[PDB]
Amino acid sequence: SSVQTAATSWGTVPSIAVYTANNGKITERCWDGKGWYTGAFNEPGDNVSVTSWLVGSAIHIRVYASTGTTTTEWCWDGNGWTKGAYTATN
Amino acid sequence: SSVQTAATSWGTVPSIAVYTANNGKITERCWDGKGWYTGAFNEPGDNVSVTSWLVGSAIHIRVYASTGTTTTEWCWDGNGWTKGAYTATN
Amino acid sequence: SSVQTAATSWGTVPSIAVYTANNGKITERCWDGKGWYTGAFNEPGDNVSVTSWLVGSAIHIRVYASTGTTTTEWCWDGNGWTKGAYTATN
Ligand SMILES: [Mg+2]
Ligand SMILES: [Mg+2]
Ligand SMILES: [Mg+2]
């Protein structure tokens, strides 16, 4: 048993975000070209995936957090995290 | 035990595809800027990864589906899924 | 129990790299538009994630290799792999 990670990168820098699922929680570490710091994201999950896109002045990040058969989408859109509309089936 | 996901995004929209391995099968959910729908992809796997690239009028998606020690590549190239040439070793 | 993969793609080609964790080791397979070959990367891990970015003449790849609660970042920057500064917490 090992922790599970997901990574994304963006920008003219570039910047990196790494999400780690451990002990039922996903946390976030971010690289800005100088150092790693802990991001604001902290939500439940045992498995994580991520994707992102940069448009305008905002990175948009989507984190898919799964526990059991429930996957929750978390959305960063420039200045905050909110729960997304993702569902695994209709 | 939790389901396992992989996510990719593309386009001036953007669009998102999320692949989920559950019960030995990988299925696909897609976002088009308005809603989530179920994609055509349905192949066996217990672990999944994905990458994609947009060139021309087609998103090209590569899904790596693993069961045991066998990983199968599935290729979307604009208008259909086909098995790729990927092998894990020579 | 299945092997675990992570995939990234880049370039005007494009090229693909697929990393597989199996038996405690991560290995690398690469596609150049013609065939799959085995990459140089070979480091311990039970879980893997990846991201990459292309700037200049070099693909830059970051591989996050986890065993237990330890995640090690491996950095490709055009012509070699080195251990990165990533840590999971301060
Ligand atoms: Mg992704
Ligand atoms: Mg990927
Ligand atoms: Mg990634």
What is the C48 CA–ligand 2 centroid distance (Å)? 11
The boundaries of the domain holding residue A64 are: 1-84
DSSP, residue by residue, B21-62? EETTEEEEEEE-SS-EEEEEEEEE-SEEEEEEEEETTEEEEE
A61 and A8 in contact (C-beta within 8 Å)?
A: yes
CA proximity to C40, closest of C55, C50, C54, C30: C30
Is B72 an interface residue toward C (CB < 8 Å)?
no
Backbone angles phi, psi at C24, to 5 degrees: 90, 0
Which residues does C21 contact at the CB level (< 8 Å), separation at least 6?
Answer: C3, C4, C5, C45, C46, C47, C48, C65
Spell out which residues of chain C touch residue B55, defining contact as CB-CB under 8 Å.
Answer: 14
Rounded CA gap, B72 and A54, in Å?
31
Q: Find residue B63's DSSP bridge partners.
A: B50, B74
C90 located within any domain:
no
Interface test with A, best of C53, C54, C72, C74 (most A CBs within 10 A): C53
The two structure tokens encoding residue B44? 């066996």
In the β-sheet with B36-44, what is the strand arrangement from edge to edge?
B4-10, B15-22, B25-31, B36-44
Edge-first strand order for the sheet with A4-10 is A4-10, A15-22, A25-31, A36-44
- Measured over the CA atoms of residue B28, residue B44, residue A9 and residue A27, the dihedral's sign is positive
CATH code of the domain in which B34 resides? 2.40.128.190
Q: Is residue A77 in some structural domain?
A: yes
**Among A40, A49, A22, residue whose Cα is nearest residue A81:** A40
Whether A33 and A4 have beta carbons less than 8 Å apart is answered as no
Q: Does a structural domain hold residue A48?
A: yes
Q: How many whole angstroms separate alpha carbon A80 and alpha carbon B27? A: 29
Distance from C-alpha of A63 to C-alpha of A28, rounded to nearest angstrom: 10
Chain A contact for B52 (CB, 8 A cutoff): no
Write b or e for each residue in A34-73: b if 16 or more Cβ atoms lie within 10 A of its Cβ, otherwise e: eebeebebebebbbbbbbbbeeeeebbbbbbbbbeeebbb
Distances (CA, A) of B14 to B8, B11, B52, B89, C24: 10, 5, 13, 35, 36
Sign, CA dihedral C30-C32-C36-C40, equals negative
- In chain C, residues with a C-beta closer than 8 Å to the C-beta of B47 are 2-5
| Ligand that lies nearest to the alpha carbon of residue C8, given by its number in the listed order | 2
Whether residue C39 contacts residue C29, with contact meaning beta carbons closer than 8 Å, is answered with yes
Helix (H) or strand (E) segment spanning residue B75: strand B70-76
* Nearby residues of B3 by Cβ (< 8 Å), 6 or more positions away: A47, A66, A68, A69, A71, A88, B20, B21, B22
**Residue in B closest to A6 by C-alpha:** B6
Asked if the structure places residue C73 within a domain, the reply is yes
C61: Cβ–Cβ under 8 A, 6 or more apart, which residues? C8, C17, C50, C51, C52, C75, C76
DSSP C23: T
Sign of CA dihedral A87, C50, C43, B43: positive
What resolution (Å)? 1.5
Spatial strand order in the sheet of B58-67: B47-55, B58-67, B70-76, B81-83
Q: Does the CB of B23 have a partner CB in chain C at under 8 Å?
A: no
B5 CA: distance to closest CA in chain A (Å): 6
Structure tokens at C76: 């490709």
Q: Is C3 part of a structural domain of the chain?
A: yes
Contact list in B for residue C37 (CB cut-off 8 A) is 90
Q: Is residue C89 part of a domain?
A: no
Token representation of residue A65: 């957090």
Backbone angles phi, psi at C89, to 5 degrees: -150, 165
Please report whether residue A90 resides in a domain.
no
The answer to whether C51 faces chain B, any CB pair under 8 Å, is no
**CA A71, CA B5: separation in Å to the nearest integer?**
9
Residue B51 at interface with chain A, using a CB cutoff of 8 Å = no
Report helix, strand or coil for A34. Answer: coil
CA angle B20, B69, C25 (to 5 degrees): 100
CB A69 to CB B22 under 8 A?
yes
Query: What does the block give as tokens for A39?
Result: 């991001």
Helix (H) or strand (E) holding A15: strand A15-22
DSSP state of A88: S
Q: How many domains does chain C have?
A: 1
Cα A55 versus chain centre, distance:
17
Residue B44 within a domain: yes
Q: In this structure, is the dihedral angle defined by the CA atoms of residues B48, C50, C10 and B14, taken in order, positive or negative?
A: positive
Nearest to C9 by CA among B39, A78, B49, B20: B49
- Out of C4, C8, C37, closest to residue B47 by CB: C4
